[PDB]
Amino acid sequence: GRLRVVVLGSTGSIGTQALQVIADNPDRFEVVGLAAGGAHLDTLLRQRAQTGVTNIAVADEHAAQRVGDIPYHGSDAATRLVEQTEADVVLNALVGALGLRPTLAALKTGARLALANKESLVAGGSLVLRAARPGQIVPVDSEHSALAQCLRGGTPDEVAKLVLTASGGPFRGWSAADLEHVTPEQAGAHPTWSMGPMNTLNSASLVNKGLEVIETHLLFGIPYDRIDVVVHPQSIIHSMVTFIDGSTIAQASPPDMKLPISLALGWPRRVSGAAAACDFHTASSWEFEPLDTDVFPAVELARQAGVAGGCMTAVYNAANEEAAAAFLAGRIGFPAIVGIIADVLHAADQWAVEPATVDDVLDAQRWARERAQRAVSG
Amino acid sequence: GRLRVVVLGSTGSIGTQALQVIADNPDRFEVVGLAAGGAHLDTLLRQRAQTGVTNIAVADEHAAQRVGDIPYHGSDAATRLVEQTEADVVLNALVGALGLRPTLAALKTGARLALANKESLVAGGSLVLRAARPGQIVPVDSEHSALAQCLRGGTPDEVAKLVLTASGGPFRGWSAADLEHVTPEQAGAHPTWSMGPMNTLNSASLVNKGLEVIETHLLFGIPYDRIDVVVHPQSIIHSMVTFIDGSTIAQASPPDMKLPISLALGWPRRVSGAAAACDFHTASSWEFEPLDTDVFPAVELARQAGVAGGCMTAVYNAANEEAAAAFLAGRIGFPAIVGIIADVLHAADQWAVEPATVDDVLDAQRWARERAQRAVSG
Ligand SMILES: NC(=O)C1=CN([C@@H]2O[C@H](COP(=O)(O)OP(=O)(O)OC[C@H]3O[C@@H](n4cnc5c(N)ncnc54)[C@H](OP(=O)(O)O)[C@@H]3O)[C@@H](O)[C@H]2O)C=CC1
Ligand SMILES: NC(=O)C1=CN([C@@H]2O[C@H](COP(=O)(O)OP(=O)(O)OC[C@H]3O[C@@H](n4cnc5c(N)ncnc54)[C@H](OP(=O)(O)O)[C@@H]3O)[C@@H](O)[C@H]2O)C=CC1
Ligand SMILES: CC(=O)N(O)CCCP(=O)(O)O
Ligand SMILES: CC(=O)N(O)CCCP(=O)(O)O
Ligand SMILES: [Mn+2]
Ligand SMILES: [Mn+2]
């Protein structure tokens, strides 16, 4: 049938690519809602006109005033758009932990949650898991989409290791001393993927990979000591599963988010011609190397937060959101992003308790941001 | 849950490795029959003692007399053993088209056929397919084991291409002029796999990969136009499947036939600890390059034979068996192996007809061998 899709974050990197997939596949998909922040009204107005969709949410009030005739506006506009729109799939391509309430609202409607917004799962943790039925959350994140495909390759007790690939970012091979002089311009240029600013920055600092290690544990229920990271500079292999017999199954394609987007929207069905395939008629090489954990401890820190569990993963992410914003603002140097995450985590023992309510997560995040902000100031 | 296994070709490369997998997994597998040619009686003696199996076929009558206590001897001994032994799995690791009657007898028993002996399927073609039920033939050949695993990644209508990897053999990158000087000793040394003499020679000439393209078509029912080959010198990726959305799924492991052997015996269940997994703690690379079909046309010749169909694939393989033997005997140069195959195939029009009975295949093989022998002697 023709699936009704709500696109949250429609004007961003993932959102724009998702609308193209939808526009190219009108027999399979239909847009029934759009949500954005209000920073790119030209784009949103174009989207309204091209899709015919008037069911729109805009977060910024001043932005919502300028356009007018907007059904949903303000801080919970995205969430209310989800609560009040009949849909089969909600694509959550918001950025940051602010995607948490839309995620919980999406899961309550019973629709499929095509999840690009990894932070909402990392922050919500068990709370999000408790809200979802088996297979209701379908990963858009390239590594997790790859893992889901590779896991068709055996039964649960046959899985030995999940192996996440990391590009290494623009600072692969750099020394700790080199990192001291990193600028936002340098951090904002990713070697293999074109993305929004936050995922781009997080990929450079390796916090993205740490978030993805937590995401893997949550989505697939595999222990942290069986989740590995390998640096693969081409970003063609998107991740791999190693089975108990010694076999590894890997998923590969030229880097293009339209592929995992299309798969998440029409899960479990594949979408013909979503993206280009690898060309095995032209010479190529796929390289692997260990992550330099001394220079890039963000993944080890994510493991520590994940093993502590409960609200600790929301702490990890919230400390990053504050510190990363501080770096972009020129308030701290690049190494201090992960420096501050570590300091906040080291003082966060009280948050190693399972959240009962959304308010427990929000409290954890509030504490974390305040702590990170104090570190930025002093 | 203890599976009864007959091992045909027990004393050879695959056979030996299979007996090791079985010895390591007594709770899963039991040997109930062995067949061999009679050329390695020391090995056969060891195997009889270690398995406690006296249900043994030996092709050479004088050899059977020398070892003693052999119930089946002669050229029909392997077939007889299969017809007269209760088994759950017949592992056919005979070499050459002489595995055909055992293959057919195995299928008639209803047992799973764990097929290493690709030549029996290549030669039998539709005759073998008619004798098999769906899922009855389970591949041992490493590429086809890999493809079977990767095909879990989608539904049949979602498959765009099956991609077979080829090591390129010892003469990877060599010119046509270089091939003229090849000795049997050079051809007998493979860069990535340790195997019996025939598969070793066939891998050097690229006839092995030709046979494997035909085997792929027959096993998986995928048209020749959707079966591709790429050269991968590491032999770590064992084959891949490209799906209609642009996703590729690949299976990889350090080269060790115990992995596909173990999976074939236990299909669909994986066998814990069968082989070592890829280690991503040390830097490495996986390389791909095209095959130069000007120098190595064996794969294109196999496709041509397969497309012609009927007994043409038996002709391709029989011409190879005869020409390969002539090369090993010093009667022809190395490039003449594939040269003779091409000459026989392009004159083989009378054999582009489906075999009604095994005798039709046997007649096609006789014709091809005689044709090849006249090419050698001329
Ligand atoms: N881009 C990629 O390739 C990948 C991204 N991801 C994840 O997907 C998510 C989206 O990333 P990406 O597309 O790069 O991000 P972008 O920055 O490109 O887009 C973010 C979107 O969210 C909207 N937005 C921002 N703030 C708010 C708010 N307060 N309320 C409602 N909407 C808001 C923006 O609207 P506007 O700008 O118009 O205000 C924009 O549409 C992230 O969680 C990211 O980590 C994961 C895998 C790869
Ligand atoms: N080796 C490998 O890794 C791979 C092999 N294959 C395929 O598997 C099959 C076996 O290959 P491999 O193990 O290398 O071959 P080998 O030459 O190592 O072994 C051949 C086996 O067949 C027996 N044999 C030979 N002639 C006869 C006969 N007339 N009657 C009965 N038995 C006979 C031999 O017995 P004896 O020597 O005691 O007389 C031996 O047990 C081949 O079809 C090959 O192409 C496929 C994938 C990889
Ligand atoms: C494409 C994707 O899903 N990402 O999260 C970006 C990955 C870039 P890196 O591997 O973290 O450098
Ligand atoms: C291991 C295996 O299954 N083979 O068939 C040998 C492959 C060697 P090549 O790729 O044909 O050179
Ligand atoms: Mn990712
Ligand atoms: Mn093979």
UniProtKB/Swiss-Prot annotation, chains A, B:
Upper classification of the organism: Bacteria, Bacillati, Actinomycetota, Actinomycetes, Mycobacteriales
Keywords: Isoprene biosynthesis, Manganese, Metal-binding, NADP, Oxidoreductase
Free-text function comment from the UniProt entry: Catalyzes the NADPH-dependent rearrangement and reduction of 1-deoxy-D-xylulose-5-phosphate (DXP) to 2-C-methyl-D-erythritol 4-phosphate (MEP).
Sequence positions that bind 1-deoxy-D-xylulose 5-phosphate: 118, 142-143, 167, 190, 203, 208-209, 212
Gene Ontology biological-process annotations: isopentenyl diphosphate biosynthetic process, methylerythritol 4-phosphate pathway involved in terpenoid biosynthetic process; terpenoid biosynthetic process, mevalonate-independent
Family the UniProt entry places it in: Belongs to the DXR family.
Species whose genome carries this gene: Mycobacterium tuberculosis (strain ATCC 25618 / H37Rv)
Names of required cofactors: Mg(2+); Mn(2+)
EC number: 1.1.1.267
Full protein name: 1-deoxy-D-xylulose 5-phosphate reductoisomerase
Keyword Glycosyltransferase among UniProt keywords: no
MF terms in GO: 1-deoxy-D-xylulose-5-phosphate reductoisomerase activity; cobalt ion binding; magnesium ion binding; manganese ion binding; NADPH binding
Xref: HAMAP family: DXP_reductoisom
SUPFAM superfamilies for this protein: 1-deoxy-D-xylulose-5-phosphate reductoisomerase, C-terminal domain, Glyceraldehyde-3-phosphate dehydrogenase-like, C-terminal domain, NAD(P)-binding Rossmann-fold domains
Catalytic activity: 2-C-methyl-D-erythritol 4-phosphate + NADP(+) = 1-deoxy-D-xylulose 5-phosphate + NADPH + H(+)
Top-level lineage group: Bacteria
Residues annotated for NADPH binding in this entry: 11-14, 37, 117, 119, 196
